[PDB]
């Protein structure tokens, strides 16, 4: 809704006595529901998302080191110790170095040396938990009335659903109401998945894969980075010093490792790039407006000429300049002579309530050459169409 | 030199009439050259390096995008154009998007859409060319004379070589001649020095040129193949999501884990190679062979201690002696004065008074006695060697 602009479009035709109609809604794709003597219903999946998901883990992929301290005792008497050894935010290594005369050591052999460095994570990846019962989804619904595209945003009724929400009613003024009985299909394995977000970008990843990452990781409460050694390298000691270096930024390797996973985008709410919604649509309470109106006989004008939609249909915008509340006769014939409709009207029973009103018509013409005829008499509009 | 402090130590003993002695020097490793009736020569490889190598390539491994511009025409109305399409520093894509009445074009079909973005490299890797004719190497040479460790840097002669033989004169001890050749692991014509921030490597040219990353030259600053770090997601209506790919520092470094390392002076030093040397020992003379024997009292400034080389070192002070030589032996008994030990510091010496002299001896296995001096003034130290 509106399904004319959305290129991936399916038509579902209801049977005359049908009360319910099955329809599955996919992302970037919409469905047009038709039923005899009833207005056409455009349905579409807008978003499937999660609100306020809980953090379970953080995984650092870029770390910086500060406050690098070194203690370098001599052989025999002396275990080396640094105060930074008993602090939580320090990556430390305890080793022994070859020392003797020349390094200020009265004996030749191994001297204890400890190197500690402040571990502070520059950039980390957030791992949120996904709950099925916290999933909400949004569906656009809009009836096929003669409305301008610039009025679509006024007509579209947007519906919000929860994980276990029930059938939802949508009433269109002067057209009755429809009922949507929808069910959400995740495409995710909650008991085995995380939301992994780096800076701006997010994914649906395997929990096992995330926990098996060889990178430092944190928790939801205490802020002490665990397994810091993954991003901190201690080179072999020379005399009384140790080269302590932080490893490279792991953004790239991670992202390349994430190329095939289901995508997620967080915006001012976590949108899911997948999934779909199974819906049962009640059409019986949907009524056609102005079936008893008189016929428009006044001069009409194509504000917008019949044009191809790519859906195998044609659309046009007709202005009714003088004609009062009246209905518009639109048919697609094989000739100017026979008044036999070979085309199918998607915008069922067109109407012009007020004057100078612009009304949008969509028709499914037959294959080949045809005539789009709108109105009667000398006032009627005819437009040549070819559809191989 | 001095090879005592360097734990990885080899001994090379020359034959009596030998004029030349072969020796191979590896990184962080030294050799002690001995020869009968001649002073011991400590040789070591300090550095093998390159001076001012020429930059040849750059390879961006982190890029940032700014100035994201987009131009979007409707179907059947023209190709979309941006001013930034013609600038050198912009990554651009031209595509077509699904359009119609839904986005405000009066026809349904493909509308031209172009997206450009300012490409600026945050962090890049420099690829220098390695010219073997710019390779220099440094060798420490130092004789085993009776000195203290704190005087070693004063005694040590440091030598520089490029891609002939160099003479090293020790005052009062003659001179040695080093005919050295440097062997490094480089296919100069098939290698780069690859430097990122602080760390550098010796990399293979093919690998460097085959990297799926944007690359530049030493001259003009126009980044080529910018698409390697820039992704244009499929167009929706009138926009395109333009993303810069992730920092490639980690993947690059992990791909480089096994390669030969390179560093800088705080002059690109190589973490490898070795030097093959021919050492001339004939012109080396021993000092103070005719000095009298120290008969006055001596004292251990530093007691005999294990070096880890199977040898022992000690520091002896001569306070009340004149220019004199010190008799050092290692016997298996205090009565028998028969030396079973090998003197590394050949013919110890005391030029001035209160002089402290370092003795290094290679004692025999088992129980032994280190004897310094004669008479009642002599120092004895029981030593055990497994």
């Amino acid at each position, epitope marked *: 809704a509106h399904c004319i602009g959305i290129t991936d479009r399916d038509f579902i035709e209801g049977v005359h006595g049908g009360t319910w109609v099955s329809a599955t809604l996919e992302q970037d794709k919409c469905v047009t529901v038709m039923a005899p003597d009833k207005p056409s219903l455009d349905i579409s999946l807008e978003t499937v998302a999660i609100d306020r998901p809980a953090e379970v883990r953080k995984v650092c992929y870029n770390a910086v080191l*500060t*406050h*690098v*301290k*070194i*203690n*370098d*005792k*001599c052989p025999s008497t*002396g275990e*080396a*110790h640094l*105060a*930074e050894e008993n*602090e939580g935010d320090n990556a430390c290594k305890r080793t022994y170095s070859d*020392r003797g005369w020349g*390094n*200020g*050591c*009265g004996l030749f052999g191994k*001297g204890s040396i400890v190197a500690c460095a*402040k571990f502070t994570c520059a950039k980390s990846m957030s791992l949120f938990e996904v709950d099925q019962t916290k999933i909400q989804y949004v569906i656009r619904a809009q009836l096929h009335v003669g409305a301008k595209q610039e009025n679509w945003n006024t007509d579209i009724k947007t519906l919000k659903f929860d994980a276990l929400s029930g059938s939802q009613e949508v009433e269109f003024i002067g057209y009755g109401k429809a009922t949507l009985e929808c069910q959400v299909q995740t495409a995710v394995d909650f008991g085995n998945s995380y939301i992994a977000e780096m800076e701006t970008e997010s994914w649906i990843v395997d929990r096992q894969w995330a926990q098996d990452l060889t990178l430092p990781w944190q928790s939801g409460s205490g802020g002490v980075w665990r397994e810091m050694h993954h991003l901190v390298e201690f080179e072999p000691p020379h*005399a*009384a*010093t*140790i*080269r*302590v270096l932080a490893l490279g930024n792991q953004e790239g390797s991670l992202k390349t490792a994430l190329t095939g996973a289901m995508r997620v985008t967080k915006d001012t709410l976590y949108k899911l790039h997948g999934g779909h919604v199974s819906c049962r649509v009640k059409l019986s309470a949907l009524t056609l407006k102005g079936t008893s109106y008189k016929i428009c006989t006044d001069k009409m004008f194509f504000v917008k000429n019949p044009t191809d939609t790519g859906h195998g249909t044609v659309v046009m915008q007709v202005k009714v300049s003088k004609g009062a509340p009246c209905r518009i006769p639109v048919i697609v014939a094989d000739d100017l002579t026979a008044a036999i409709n070979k085309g199918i009207l998607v915008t069922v029973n067109p109407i012009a309530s007020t004057n100078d009103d612009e009304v949008l018509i969509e028709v499914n013409p037959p294959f080949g050459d045809s005539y789009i005829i709108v109105g009667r008499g000398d006032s009627r509009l005819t437009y040549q169409w070819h559809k191989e | 030199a001095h090879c005592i402090g360097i734990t990885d130590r080899d001994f090379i003993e020359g034959v009596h009439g030998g004029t030349w002695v072969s020796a191979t020097l590896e990184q962080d490793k030294c050799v002690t050259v001995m020869a009968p009736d001649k002073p011991s020569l400590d040789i070591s490889l300090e550095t093998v390096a390159i001076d001012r190598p020429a930059e040849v390539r750059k390879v961006c491994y982190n890029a940032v995008l700014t100035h994201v511009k987009i131009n979007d025409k409707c179907p059947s109305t023209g190709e979309a154009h941006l001013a930034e399409e013609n600038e050198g520093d912009n990554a651009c894509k031209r595509t077509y998007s699904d359009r119609g009445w839904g986005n405000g074009c009066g026809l349904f079909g493909k509308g031209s859409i172009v997206a450009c973005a300012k490409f600026t490299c945050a962090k890049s890797m420099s690829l220098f060319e390695v010219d073997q004719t710019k390779i220099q190497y440094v060798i420490r040479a130092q004789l085993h004379v009776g000195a203290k460790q*704190e005087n070693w*840097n004063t005694d040590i002669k440091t030598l520089k070589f490029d891609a002939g033989s160099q003479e090293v004169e020790f005052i009062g001890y003659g001179k040695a001649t080093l005919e050295c050749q440097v062997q490094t692991a480089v296919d100069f014509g098939n290698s780069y020095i690859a430097e990122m921030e602080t760390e550098s490597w010796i990399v293979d040219r093919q690998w460097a040129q085959d990297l799926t990353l944007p690359w530049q030259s030493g001259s003009g600053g126009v980044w080529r193949e910018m698409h390697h770090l820039v992704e244009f997601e499929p167009p929706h209506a009138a926009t395109i999501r333009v993303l810069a790919l992730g920092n490639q520092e980690g993947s690059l470094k992990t791909a480089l884990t096994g390669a030969m390392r390179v560093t800088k002076d705080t002059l690109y030093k190589l973490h490898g190679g070795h030097v093959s040397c021919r050492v001339k020992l004939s012109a080396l003379t021993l000092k103070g062979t005719s000095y009298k024997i120290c008969t006055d009292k001596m004292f251990f400034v*530093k007691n005999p201690t294990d070096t880890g080389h199977g040898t022992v070192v000690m520091q002896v002070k001569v306070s009340k002696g004149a220019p004199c030589r010190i008799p050092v032996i290692v016997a298996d008994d205090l009565t028998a004065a028969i030396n079973k030990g090998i003197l590394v510091t050949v013919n110890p010496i005391a030029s001035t008074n209160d002089d402290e002299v370092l003795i290094e001896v290679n004692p025999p296995f088992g129980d032994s006695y280190i004897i310094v001096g004669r008479g009642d003034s002599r120092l004895t130290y029981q030593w055990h060697k497994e």
Partner: antibody
Amino acid sequence: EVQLVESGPRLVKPSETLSLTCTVSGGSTYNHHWSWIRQPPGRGLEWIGYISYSGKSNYNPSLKSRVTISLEPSTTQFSLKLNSLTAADTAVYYCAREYRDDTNYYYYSLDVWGPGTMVT
Amino acid sequence: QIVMTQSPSTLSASVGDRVTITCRASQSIGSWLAWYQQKPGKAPKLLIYKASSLESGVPSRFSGSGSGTEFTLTISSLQPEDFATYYCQQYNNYSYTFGPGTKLEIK
């Protein structure tokens, strides 16, 4: 836990020399710059000077002509010797470690101090 | 020898206050500046190094800023511990120079 203790003659008559010694425990003296700093009663701190294991040393210009700082590496202790004393030299003398890491490029200035010793 | 000045000479304040001490070098010293806290009869303790970096484990209420000539030490919320004399010191190049000190006492 790197600790420094300075010791030596407490009461010094004028015109003599000052023999102070700082003893280093918990760490060797191969690294860092070992320094002396003094503080007269009721005034501010005056940086006297330093010496390293390398042999490189440096003294305060107002004191350079008199000050001699030496290093005994074996016992890991270093000594201050100030000549041509005066009433101005009456101060609390601290020995301190200037931490210098030339491998990872970290410098914390004087990070470890001794109790300080009062010379008159 | 580079000359260091401090301002103010003395500051009286109460517990819970925000205080800011200033330190000036005769010439640019980059960021190589240290802050020391000295209590009567005791040795100076290292608080800040490299202008802004805190020594572990100095309370996070302590902070430093500045580079070149101008420097400031800041205590966001004063405590009974903090009442002592604060000295600044340049260690960009020898000879090193301490400041005259800023005395901080209770009102």
